[PDB]
Amino acid sequence: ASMTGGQQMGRGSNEEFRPEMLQGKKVIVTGASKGIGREMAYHLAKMGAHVVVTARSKETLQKVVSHCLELGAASAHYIAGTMEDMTFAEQFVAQAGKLMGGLDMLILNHITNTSLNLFHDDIHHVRKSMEVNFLSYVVLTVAALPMLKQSNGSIVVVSSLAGKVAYPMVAAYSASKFALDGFFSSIRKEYSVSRVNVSITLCVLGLIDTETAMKAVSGIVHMQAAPKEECALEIIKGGALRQEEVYYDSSRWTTLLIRNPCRKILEELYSTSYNMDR
Amino acid sequence: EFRPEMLQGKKVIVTGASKGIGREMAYHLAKMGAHVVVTARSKETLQKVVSHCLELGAASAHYIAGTMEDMTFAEQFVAQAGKLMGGLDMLILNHITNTSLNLFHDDIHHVRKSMEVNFLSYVVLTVAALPMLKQSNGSIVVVSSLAGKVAYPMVAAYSASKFALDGFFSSIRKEYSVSRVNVSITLCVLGLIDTETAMKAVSGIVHMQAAPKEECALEIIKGGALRQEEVYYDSSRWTTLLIRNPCRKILEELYSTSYNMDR
Ligand SMILES: NC(=O)c1ccc[n+]([C@@H]2O[C@H](COP(=O)([O-])OP(=O)(O)OC[C@H]3O[C@@H](n4cnc5c(N)ncnc54)[C@H](OP(=O)(O)O)[C@@H]3O)[C@@H](O)[C@H]2O)c1
Ligand SMILES: NC(=O)c1ccc[n+]([C@@H]2O[C@H](COP(=O)([O-])OP(=O)(O)OC[C@H]3O[C@@H](n4cnc5c(N)ncnc54)[C@H](OP(=O)(O)O)[C@@H]3O)[C@@H](O)[C@H]2O)c1
Ligand SMILES: O=C(C[C@]1(c2ccccc2)[C@H]2C[C@H]3C[C@@H]1C[C@@H](C2)[C@@H]3O)N1CC(O)C1
Ligand SMILES: O=C(C[C@]1(c2ccccc2)[C@H]2C[C@H]3C[C@@H]1C[C@@H](C2)[C@@H]3O)N1CC(O)C1
């Protein structure tokens, strides 16, 4: 280790992913006790990364940590708690960073439990979706930024197609995913002009075969689900490659139409217009 | 094709109507002969708006003062405003929390307040107004921004709240369509407008062509009266050319087929 030195990221490292890119990297994965979160932890362990996983369930998190170590994780730990608690969110990052001796990648993936329903008067679900799905991500980012700045790290935000286009029956959920795009895309512009070398990856996912999603859509929505294992790897790759956005869905139509080149053109036109050095 | 007669005798709520775009909407509405209920925190500024409204031609004009930080006030305001007019035809959601241009560092208080005032209060107001809007086959008009469609630095919290409006209101618009709820939803995407607040906030950060507030206010009302899904208003021809997202509309249409709505 003391007699070793160099870099994994040279020519082509912005285009071609290699699992060696995550070897020895210090990664946090939230909502990692099941679904996409757990699959990402598993891929990270296999690549030789140090991982800290979180979710509310201590028992489920223990099993993820055990399997991570079996897979070849440089180190694997968990810290259990609710992302409804902003104090837990803030303290969780401080512990996790101490546990690894820094932080290279922050993977923000948890959501509050959501079922498909027409919106009528559930303001409690609207507020909780905004607190858990959005506000806790901002709190985690603030807590992690000093460590990510020291490592020229990465923030990976797990979003949805419902965070880019309108879908009925997910109004609160969709509001919170759209809010993530607005917030993280704005700070990405700020980091660029402020020369903060921390990348931000927004992951736009279609239906994924997680137990929660398959149960929730049953008899309501009839869509093709994509495999969770492949989903989880594509999220990691986008993060490691420092891509601004990752798109992952079963439909070839989606991948063909989801990009918004006019938004990118407008942002470039507006990019000069302001005097931000004030 | 819009005609000012479309608003004659209509029962309209305008929030954040003590100044800027909101006050100019109250004026175009009063001119057209509508019944209006204006709101903001400042009692003294609201009184002046109510007086000038009556002079311009309003069927009736009232104000109810209070903060949209208070969800109880938001909910009760709509019921009181509805009682004053004996119903509701149009709900114009326009207020924002005071915001200045700044890089984001650790102001979680501003992030939460922007989400509460700019977004959550609009959802609370919509829930309170929906029974009356259903009776009249009314309209909801949501005032958003270009910063609610594309990324801008120095407005992270504000932008998050405007994006949230698009996500929420575009989703319920799909639900109303399939549920046969005849209440239209208009999302207004505005560029820089020559309001005193914006001209002060941008000073020395931007020298753009400030679109006139009077014309802005009318275009918002027209979009609402015409039941348009989205209204775009900016000084730049390039903005109007690039702001639309036809691919999002195509994707939404393709995904609609996956739903079992007979449940
Ligand atoms: N599955 C899909 O079809 C799909 C599609 C698009 C986007 N996504 C996005 O992908 C992400 C993962 O979704 P998923 O389907 O993998 O979900 P999942 O299997 O239901 O997992 C949710 C995770 O978050 C945790 N969680 C729940 N409530 C929490 C709370 N209050 N505080 C902290 N953690 C909490 C859960 O464990 P605990 O209950 O023990 O805390 C679990 O670890 C979400 O951001 C979702 O929007 C998924
Ligand atoms: N001006 C622009 O360039 C521009 C561009 C794009 C979008 N927009 C959107 O257009 C709308 C109007 O903007 P504007 O420039 O006309 O703003 P403005 O002149 O500053 O007016 C804001 C209004 O909201 C009220 N308000 C503020 N805080 C409130 C609170 N806590 N509770 C209740 N009401 C509150 C204010 O009155 P009190 O202070 O007396 O409460 C005032 O009537 C906003 O939704 C804004 O995002 C404006
Ligand atoms: O975001 C998701 C997945 C979910 C969904 C499922 C159908 C329709 C909208 C949302 C699943 C069901 C609810 C809402 C949301 C998040 C999870 C899983 C939650 O349990 N999609 C699929 C679409 O392509 C974007
Ligand atoms: O949303 C607005 C107007 C505002 C703004 C001003 C420059 C840049 C971003 C935001 C004005 C200054 C702040 C933030 C926000 C809302 C008001 C007026 C607030 O006082 N724009 C103009 C741009 O095209 C989209």
From Swiss-Prot, chain A:
Belongs to the short-chain dehydrogenases/reductases (SDR) family. Widely expressed, highest expression in liver, lower in testis, ovary, lung, foreskin fibroblasts, and much lower in kidney. Expressed in liver (at protein level). Expressed in the basal cells of the corneal epithelium and in the ciliary nonpigmented epithelium (both at mRNA and at protein level). Controls the reversible conversion of biologically active glucocorticoids such as cortisone to cortisol, and 11-dehydrocorticosterone to corticosterone in the presence of NADP(H). Participates in the corticosteroid receptor-mediated anti-inflammatory response, as well as metabolic and homeostatic processes. Plays a role in the secretion of aqueous humor in the eye, maintaining a normotensive, intraocular environment. Bidirectional in vitro, predominantly functions as a reductase in vivo, thereby increasing the concentration of active glucocorticoids. It is linked to Cortisone reductase deficiency 2: An autosomal dominant error of cortisone metabolism characterized by a failure to regenerate cortisol from cortisone, resulting in increased cortisol clearance, activation of the hypothalamic- pituitary axis and ACTH-mediated adrenal androgen excess. Clinical features include hyperandrogenism resulting in hirsutism, oligo- amenorrhea, and infertility in females and premature pseudopuberty in males. NADP(+) binds at residues 31-57, 82-83, 109-111, 173-177, 208-212. This is 11-beta-hydroxysteroid dehydrogenase 1. Pathway: Steroid metabolism. GO terms for biological process: lung development; steroid catabolic process. It is a single-pass type II membrane protein. It comes from the Eukaryota. Glycans are attached at residues 113, 152, 197. Hexose-6-phosphate dehydrogenase (H6PD) provides cosubstrate NADPH, and the glucose-6-phosphate transporter in the ER-membrane supplies the substrate for H6PDH, their activities stimulate the reduction of cortisone and abolish the oxidation of cortisol. Substrate binds at residue 160. PANTHER family: 11-BETA-HYDROXYSTEROID DEHYDROGENASE 1, HYDROXYSTEROID (11-BETA) DEHYDROGENASE 1-LIKE B-RELATED. The active site is at 173 (proton acceptor). GO terms for molecular function: 11-beta-hydroxysteroid dehydrogenase (NADP+) activity; 7-beta-hydroxysteroid dehydrogenase (NADP+) activity; cortisol dehydrogenase (NAD+) activity; NADP binding; protein homodimerization activity; steroid binding. InterPro entries: 11-beta-HSD (IPR051253), NAD(P)-bd_dom_sf (IPR036291), Sc_DH/Rdtase_CS (IPR020904), SDR_fam (IPR002347). It holds the Pfam family adh_short. The lineage of its organism: Eukaryota, Metazoa, Chordata, Craniata, Vertebrata. Glycosylated. Its EC number is 1.1.1.146, 1.1.1.201.
From Swiss-Prot, chain B:
It comes from the Eukaryota. NADP(+) binds at residues 16-42, 67-68, 94-96, 158-162, 193-197. It is a single-pass type II membrane protein. Keywords: Disease variant, Endoplasmic reticulum, Glycoprotein, Lipid metabolism, Membrane, NADP, Oxidoreductase, Signal-anchor, Steroid metabolism, Transmembrane, Transmembrane helix. Widely expressed, highest expression in liver, lower in testis, ovary, lung, foreskin fibroblasts, and much lower in kidney. Expressed in liver (at protein level). Expressed in the basal cells of the corneal epithelium and in the ciliary nonpigmented epithelium (both at mRNA and at protein level). The keyword Repeat does not apply. Substrate binds at residue 145. Glycans are attached at residues 98, 137, 182. It is found in: Endoplasmic reticulum membrane. Residues 1-263 are lumenal. The active site is at 158 (proton acceptor). Glycosylated. Pfam families: adh_short. GO terms for molecular function: 11-beta-hydroxysteroid dehydrogenase (NADP+) activity; 7-beta-hydroxysteroid dehydrogenase (NADP+) activity; cortisol dehydrogenase (NAD+) activity; NADP binding; protein homodimerization activity; steroid binding. Pathway: Steroid metabolism. It catalyses: an 11beta-hydroxysteroid + NADP(+) = an 11-oxosteroid + NADPH + H(+); cortisone + NADPH + H(+) = cortisol + NADP(+); corticosterone + NADP(+) = 11-dehydrocorticosterone + NADPH + H(+); a 7beta-hydroxysteroid + NADP(+) = a 7-oxosteroid + NADPH + H(+). Hexose-6-phosphate dehydrogenase (H6PD) provides cosubstrate NADPH, and the glucose-6-phosphate transporter in the ER-membrane supplies the substrate for H6PDH, their activities stimulate the reduction of cortisone and abolish the oxidation of cortisol. One of its GO terms (cellular component) is membrane. Its EC number is 1.1.1.146, 1.1.1.201. It is linked to Cortisone reductase deficiency 2: An autosomal dominant error of cortisone metabolism characterized by a failure to regenerate cortisol from cortisone, resulting in increased cortisol clearance, activation of the hypothalamic- pituitary axis and ACTH-mediated adrenal androgen excess. Clinical features include hyperandrogenism resulting in hirsutism, oligo- amenorrhea, and infertility in females and premature pseudopuberty in males. Controls the reversible conversion of biologically active glucocorticoids such as cortisone to cortisol, and 11-dehydrocorticosterone to corticosterone in the presence of NADP(H). Participates in the corticosteroid receptor-mediated anti-inflammatory response, as well as metabolic and homeostatic processes. Plays a role in the secretion of aqueous humor in the eye, maintaining a normotensive, intraocular environment. Bidirectional in vitro, predominantly functions as a reductase in vivo, thereby increasing the concentration of active glucocorticoids. Homodimer. Belongs to the short-chain dehydrogenases/reductases (SDR) family. It comes from Homo sapiens (Human).
